[model samples]
Target chain A: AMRQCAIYGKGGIGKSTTTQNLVAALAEMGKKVMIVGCDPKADSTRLILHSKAQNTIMEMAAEAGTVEDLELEDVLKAGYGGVKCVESGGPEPGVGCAGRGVITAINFLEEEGAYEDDLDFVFYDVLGDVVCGGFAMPIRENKAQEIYIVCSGEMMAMYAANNISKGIVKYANSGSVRLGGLICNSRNTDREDELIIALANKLGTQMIHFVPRDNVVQRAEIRRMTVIEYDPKAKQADEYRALARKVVDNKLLVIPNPITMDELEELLMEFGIMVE
Target chain B: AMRQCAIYGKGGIGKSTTTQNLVAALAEMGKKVMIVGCDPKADSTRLILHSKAQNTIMEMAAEAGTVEDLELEDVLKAGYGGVKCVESGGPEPGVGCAGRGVITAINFLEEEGAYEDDLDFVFYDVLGDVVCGGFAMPIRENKAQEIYIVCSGEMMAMYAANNISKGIVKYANSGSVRLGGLICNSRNTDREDELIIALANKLGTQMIHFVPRDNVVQRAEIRRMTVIEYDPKAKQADEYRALARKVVDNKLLVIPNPITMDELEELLMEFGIMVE
Candidate 1:
């Protein structure tokens, strides 16, 4: 049985990098993991595969004129830790909806048997913003049951986390996918840990782990690797290891209490993240 | 009573220009006309106002932080011939959906009493492509009872006309917005007039007007005026006047028989527009 996890956040938040690294950490633990890059940018699998981009479903479908013409092997690729990788590519900027790209790719994956019995975990590295139904394809019924939102102490980041919970709320009321927790990818802002913790409380979830801002992760990414893959002995790698362990052990999935816009503003003001 | 008319076609098929010219002709008949640009580009009212762009409902809503703050007067502008002009602007490029923008703008217009007494015609110069629900706003229940597809004898243009008919078949089965006719904007293809006439016959409608390809209309457009306004004595102006007369007096409306892709291709081949 596979435990599917999806990571969502606003655009520019480090969702791709964090998901890749976390999956790398799980892979190190001898878990059979698969990373599905649900973004048109196709950068989600780069750190895992040590490649610029993997062959994506949408890109191949577009070339073939439709997804029905594609075979599974054309898109699915094997990368580090024996992790299977796939990307849902999309149109160029200012063109068609990228969210629809996500939906089509995910549907193709299920039809092609991308999720198999041997998989221990399936991680959907979704696009930064869930602007439409396409981006929410991951958390739909019987897909990703656990949703971890990546957030920082910044005002917009917390707001995005809450908004994501609201998205989860929409699904949670009808389905099994719930808010697992927030994964704090620190930006070294003042009271970073405290701010996210407060936001998590308001959202009826927890800040699962705080991956402190370190140059080692960036150094590893420069080598086209997750910290766990580049240097398993590194302290930064251990932080990801901790995150992976917490996720694997997580049992608390709740219908999050997403804050109102005014409540989010008040929280931001309380943290001095914004003026009243 | 306002005669609401919606113009449908594929993108880049000269829908906006034809609509503006038609409305200008109607204005010349001493009718109180209004042009509602239902595209995100907001170019529907440009020719009527002799302006680059008008403030759209979406743009004003965005500026005011919400649609609730937008006033009707802020978005609706009075142009040449006292023709009320409004645009339903949307997200720049691909950031958001433009179809929804049309829905929101039209809904806003309805809520704000933009449809007032003494209006002769309210023309919805819809975006060329009817990609989704937002673009189909005008032809829904209790809206435009008449739809005129502006197309040429070009293969793509005919295909678009057929596709729009398919859209109408969906709405017309449930509503009163019947297929009024095809407004043949001549591309000067070989046997262009005969080709559109055959297409209209196949679609179970008529060729409402055969607008000839003329440089004088373009010359008039360079001065931000319709041919009727720039040179009422011009032969092109008289053609539009005749078109306006037919539109006002026409009673033929029907549930169009929209063909499939293969059927459309066959029709194109029959017209010698495309090879079998």
Candidate 2:
């Protein structure tokens, strides 16, 4: 059976970079993968596509007068390790709603038979900070059954993680979506791994992966490639490979018991990540 | 005349911290400033309010059955340095449109005459990365006329800066809004200062101030305090004081000439910030 997951994290938490790298590793293992870029920026698959942001579905649809005029081939492009990439482009800022764009693009994708049975995995790289229905369209609509929050030891990251878990709890009883785990994209804060592990424990999930801080990731990003694709032998590539393995064999999905603001702060204080 | 400014940037770019510290400095100088948080996270006023995320206007309105049932005093709270703070809270993740909540909150504030003539400044701390109509509501509705994008040398931060500049350009001719400048929140990246200055120059604005990376800022944040209010004697506080002064005296607003992705990448490469 095909597995579907959506990657959620605060913006600039390396959600796109982590997702592309993990997808690349999965593709290297001969797993068929497709990436749905959910952010308006459309850079979710940049490293995989080896270009600047791909022309988004919204942009193409606008140009073609309607979404029905867009062919699957016109929207979906195969990139590194044969990973299929499609970006759901959105409005310019302060204009129309970006969340609505997510809905339009996903409906179009499904209507066009983009979710093929032969695919082993499909990942949605979503913008997670905003509390809008559009960004959560995948999980709310049952397109994604598993959720992976890419976070770090940063206070804002944890806050966003907890807040997102609350969102999951709201829809869990009525939907198939479940939080799979947290993937810590490390910022090298003090005791970062332990902090994330504890946070994961509190959320009733696993710290599925703790990707250490590495300059190689940025270097590869500069070249518009993932570490797995740019430098296959790099240690960072192995880190992503390990993460890919964990994700492939993972099965501890659960409805998260999110902590309150006070409890989250208490946990942070106990970890000495924050002071009272 | 009172200046209305909105601080925008990629999420986790230190937008709230920078804004609060700068606002604190302005308040210390006898300026009456108000902060209207535009993100759903509602942490924009944490440092000023000295608490966890305050109850948002949306949350309060929902409890009261409608926005009309709420009072300005119910939503607005005075905080550090006598700065009034209010958050435009939104729905939980994947629930409803967060942008519509912003529109509602602002309308309520206006209807209740929260914008007193005695105010010297009104700061809208906004989420900058999302290309949504709600995030841009402050700028689009002319509630904020001067835009300051808090950013760093990171690729996504710069990408958001350029993307936001495009949005400002879209609304500039039609409204009073204009790009004020860029606030470079240091990430300690190599040649960061030069890179951001180059970016600001490209956008036809100035690098208003370069706030160095400081652990003290985080330390103060843990206590729910801005550096200026927590430890006014700290050098980091002085940095924000300088930024506050710049913001107060700033007049170089313009319609930004946002660069293309290739140009942005080329500029990054020129600074040796990128491998390509």
Candidate 3:
């Protein structure tokens, strides 16, 4: 059975970088994984593909005048560790529904039989800001049954993480989508691990992994490759491997309990002195 | 004559903080201003109100049964410097059209005569992700004629800034919305000021102001106050005042020429070694 997960995070929270790195590690472990880059920017599969950005499904669909004219191979490509990569490129901003690209891309994938029996995992990389219904297409359609939020200890990051959970709860009540856990991409903030864990507990999930901040991550990014492939011996590579293992053995999915703005601010204030 | 401007930025880009501080400085200069917070989070007016979050127009509309039952005085509150503040609250995550709240709130404000003759400015503090048609209500309806993008020197921040320009271009050709300039919220990255200026030049706009990074900004935020209000004599306060001054005297609004993705990446890569 395929373990489909959606990675949601505030923009610039390193969500796509984390998703690709983790997926690359999973592929190294011999897991057949496919990545559906849901962001309109199409940079989701860059590192895995060792390129700038993939030619997204929507781009090709438009070039051919319809999605029906495209073949499976036209949109999907294999990258490092044999991870299948596809980007559902979106509309030029403020033009149309950004989520419409996700919906169309996923529908095309299904009709094209991209989800084969050999696939062990599929990851949907999503941008978690607009509070728009389109970004929640994966959860609403139950395409991704488990949702993981990549967040930091920063107030706004936590704010977005909590807001994303609110979306998950709405669909969870009607579908199979559940929150897997929180992935703490550390910002070097004080007591970041403890704070994210506390937030996870509040949401009835766990902080599945805490990836420490390192310049090595950026160093690899400059080369458009994951740390695992860039330098496996690096300590950051092992951290990603650890995250991948935790994600593999993880079973603590739940309907997230999102807190109110007052509670959220209070929680941050309570941890304020310590975080400072 | 009233000047209506919309502040757009990537999440956690310190947009609300900058908007409040600038508006506060503008108010200090004896200019009457109104802030319509378009983000669903409703934290857009917190610093001015010195509160956790202002009660939004949508929240009150829902409670009172409909927008018709709400009054201008009920949803709008006077904040520091006697600036008028209102938030357009959105639906819970993954629920409905998040932009509906903006449309409804603005319509309500217009009907209630919130935009009075004495108002010198109206700032729409908007969230810059989720390229839904609803979030562009302000630009589409010709309400916010000038747009300011708050961004950092980071790659994703620049990427978002460019995407936002794309949206502005679309509406600019159809309506009166134009790109005022890019406000560089310094992240202390290497050559951050220079990078933003170069990026701004590429977009055919100016780096209006490079607001230096300072912990005092956060120090004031912990108290739910902007630096200008929290510490009138602080150096950072003067920075906001400077920004306000530039914005007040600005006349360089233009229809932006957004570059290709390859060009953006090339610009970033050219500055890569310098940033590193």
Predicted structure with the largest DockQ when compared to the true one: 3
- Stretches of candidate 1 above 4 Å error? A274-276, B1-276
TM-score of 1: 0.54
* Residue range A3-46, candidate 3, lDDT tens digits: 99999988889889899999999999999999999887779999
Chain B TM, per prediction? 0.94, 0.97, 0.97
The worst-scoring run of ten residues by lDDT in candidate 3 chain A lies at A267-276
Label model 3 with its docking quality class: medium
In the predicted model 1, the residue pairs found to clash are B99-B134
Q: What does the lDDT read for residue B123 in candidate 2?
A: 95
lDDT of 2 by residue, B165-270 (tens): 8888777767788999999999787889999999999889999999999889878988889999889899999999999999999999888999988888887788
TM-score of each: 0.54, 0.95, 0.97
**Highest TM-score: which candidate?**
3
lDDT of 3 by residue, B81-127 (tens): 99999999888878877777888888888888988899999999988
TM-score of chain A of each: 0.94, 0.97, 0.97
lDDT of predicted model 2:
0.87
Q: What DockQ was computed for model 3?
A: 0.68
